[PDB]
Design a protein around this motif. Sequence first.
Motif, PDB file in Angstrom:
ATOM      1  N   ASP A  74      40.477  50.579  78.590  1.00 21.63           N
ATOM      2  CA  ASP A  74      41.299  49.376  78.893  1.00 21.63           C
ATOM      3  C   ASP A  74      41.295  48.447  77.692  1.00 21.63           C
ATOM      4  O   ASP A  74      42.336  48.024  77.229  1.00 21.63           O
ATOM      5  N   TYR A  75      40.151  48.150  77.148  1.00 19.14           N
ATOM      6  CA  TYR A  75      40.137  47.280  75.946  1.00 19.14           C
ATOM      7  C   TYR A  75      41.168  47.819  74.962  1.00 19.14           C
ATOM      8  O   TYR A  75      41.821  47.081  74.252  1.00 19.14           O
ATOM      9  N   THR A  93      28.360  50.866  77.706  1.00 20.30           N
ATOM     10  CA  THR A  93      29.854  50.918  77.696  1.00 20.30           C
ATOM     11  C   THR A  93      30.344  52.108  78.529  1.00 20.30           C
ATOM     12  O   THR A  93      29.569  52.938  78.958  1.00 20.30           O
ATOM     13  N   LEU A 144      34.710  44.669  71.456  1.00 17.07           N
ATOM     14  CA  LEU A 144      34.587  45.025  72.899  1.00 17.07           C
ATOM     15  C   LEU A 144      33.113  45.019  73.316  1.00 17.07           C
ATOM     16  O   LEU A 144      32.226  45.146  72.496  1.00 17.07           O
ATOM     17  N   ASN A 145      32.844  44.862  74.585  1.00 16.22           N
ATOM     18  CA  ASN A 145      31.426  44.838  75.053  1.00 16.22           C
ATOM     19  C   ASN A 145      30.656  43.714  74.355  1.00 16.22           C
ATOM     20  O   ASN A 145      29.442  43.679  74.370  1.00 16.22           O
ATOM     21  N   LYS A 148      36.086  53.386  80.731  1.00 16.00           N
ATOM     22  CA  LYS A 148      37.028  52.430  81.381  1.00 16.00           C
ATOM     23  C   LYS A 148      37.117  51.131  80.573  1.00 16.00           C
ATOM     24  O   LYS A 148      38.178  50.739  80.130  1.00 16.00           O
ATOM     25  N   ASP A 149      36.014  50.458  80.379  1.00 13.21           N
ATOM     26  CA  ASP A 149      36.054  49.187  79.599  1.00 13.21           C
ATOM     27  C   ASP A 149      36.559  49.455  78.178  1.00 13.21           C
ATOM     28  O   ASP A 149      37.219  48.627  77.580  1.00 13.21           O
TER      29      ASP A 149
END
Length: 75
Positions: free
Chosen positions: A18-19, A11, A65-66, A14-15
């Motif tokens: 943003d998530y 992870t 997420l992820n 950023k991801d």
Amino acid sequence: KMFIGGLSWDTTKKDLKDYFSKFGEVVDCTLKLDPITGRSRGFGFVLFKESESVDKVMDQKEHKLNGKVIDPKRA
């Protein structure tokens, strides 16, 4: 600020930021899951810019997420 447990070994701020950008604004977002620096703690942190934005993402911790859920807290 809050704590997000359950981050993927790959992870990033950023991801995850943003998530979490769907709840409100974010000034900070860490990720302890470094898959290359062997620094993966299995979780990261999130820091929204407003209180109303934080309480929102905390209204329902049924996140994902992820490809995995997480554990949002008040840091």
